[PDB]
Amino acid sequence: VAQLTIGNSTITTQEAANIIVGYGEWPSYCSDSDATAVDKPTRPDVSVNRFYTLDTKLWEKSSKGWYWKFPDVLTETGVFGQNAQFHYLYRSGFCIHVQCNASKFHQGALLVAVLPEYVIGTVAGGTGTEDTHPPYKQTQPGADGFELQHPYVLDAGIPISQLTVCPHQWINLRTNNCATIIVPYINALPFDSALNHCNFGLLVVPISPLDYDQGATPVIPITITLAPMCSEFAGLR
């Protein structure tokens, strides 16, 4: 055990569990011979790139699962949400860290994976004849996130049973509590909009339900801490 720091942010975390570098690539920058070599894109290092610790969600027996969108989650938050908004283009890598705090008397298993272009699909009326498009509160939940309503198909008509095909990591209470994931910038373009397009979405679902005997804390706090890697911006407004 030891604590790492990035500016004014200091998190207490375990030595170095197995990290998952999504798709074997490290969030790097973008060279000079690109599309916009004129408007030299300024790369934040100071405060912009540090440890943000989102409002902890409480695991319950009945919990269905949660998901956040990127970069949406942060475009609201602090000095990073500052850049994302008053800037024309954005490319950024991510270090995501998820941890639970539970006694050796709780049981559960959370799959934690990242899914590019996570496009939500609602119920469509029920009988299948209403072309209802997911709201804005469902498409970009912010930093509070949003709860799945049909985990089995990941609110989008896809088996979750196959989500492992994405950069994932498991959190089995009886073995580990913290899971870490490095995500590179993934998109069909070098740069893009930070407010219109959500390159990906963080998924965390209880595959084995939370359980405990009466008397033990009934809710397990899940704490998501995340940090931007090699983040770049272009065209101030």
């Binding site: 999504g22 798709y23 074997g24 690539e25 050796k104 008397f105 709780h106 049981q107 559960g108 298993a109 985990p151 089995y152 088996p159 979750i160 049973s161 196959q162 492992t164 095909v165 498991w170 089995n172 209470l173 009886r174 073995t175 590179p184 993934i186 998109n187 069909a188 373009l189 070098p190 595959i207 084995s208 339900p209 359980d211 405990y212 005997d213 008397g215 033990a216």
Partner: protein
């Protein structure tokens, strides 16, 4: 000119002939391919990925579908009792349909390779006990009891020591052809079987839940292969 004789097949359209045709836009220079993470090159890459096997493929009640992903073990189960069972039939109905491997087998007619199932105990940390996991090759009938299964290729699993365990299925081959109804299906027969028995009972101290679940994850070894593209699906693009 230059003497020539046209041979049969002239002027025919083969939906699988991979010849060349004239480019509609000769001057067009298509936007350059840039680097994108995780490119897939050969499907067998996917087949080697661990997907959740819905062994507990019994509840259908819409809100209990998440239950198919995990089966459980409890104190109530006595020593020797058969916990669960299933076959090593990647392409056929049942459990394997949930795995990605299973879904990919569907776009193919034949296949063969060693498989690999991994079990994950998700119970309380305080629980301990032993589970016997046995494989009965194709033909061998599900072992009568724990002891007879104990004589077959088995593995004693103490989730008190290790929370995970991976079993390897030496071989499965969907090669034996079958023309039943009037519809010919290249079927298994190699339904290898995997049984799981409570070697000991589920033991726990006061304060810990008397039930825990387990998750099955499967994939195929690097020696896996598939043959005969065969597009088949129940899900199609609606009008």
């Amino acid at each position: 000119g230059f003497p020539t004789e046209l041979k049969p097949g002239t002027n025919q359209f083969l939906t699988t002939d991979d010849g060349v045709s004239a480019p509609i836009l000769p001057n067009f220079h298509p936007t350059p391919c840039i680097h994108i993470p995780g490119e897939v090159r050969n499907l067998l890459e996917l087949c080697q990925v661990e997907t959740i096997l819905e062994v507990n493929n019994v509840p259908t009640n819409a809100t209990s579908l998440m239950e198919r992903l995990r089966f459980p073990v409890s104190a109530q189960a006595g020593k020797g009792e058969l916990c669960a069972v299933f076959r090593a039939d990647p392409g056929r109905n049942g459990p394997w349909q949930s795995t990605l491997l299973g879904q990919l087998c569907g776009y193919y007619t034949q296949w063969s390779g060693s498989l690999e199932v991994t079990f994950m105990f998700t119970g309380s940390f305080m629980a301990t006990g032993k589970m016997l996991i046995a494989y009965t090759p194709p033909g061998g009938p599900l072992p009568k009891d724990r002891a007879t299964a104990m004589l077959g290729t088995h593995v004693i699993w103490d989730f008190g020591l290790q929370s995970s365990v991976t079993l390897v299925i030496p071989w499965i081959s969907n090669t034996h052809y079958r023309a039943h109804a009037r519809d010919g299906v290249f079927d298994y027969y190699t339904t290898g079987l995997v049984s799981i028995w409570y070697q000991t009972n589920y033991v726990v101290p006061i304060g810990a839940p008397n039930t825990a679940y387990i998750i099955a994850l499967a994939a195929a070894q690097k020696n896996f292969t598939m043959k005969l593209c065969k597009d088949a699906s129940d899900i199609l693009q609606t009008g």
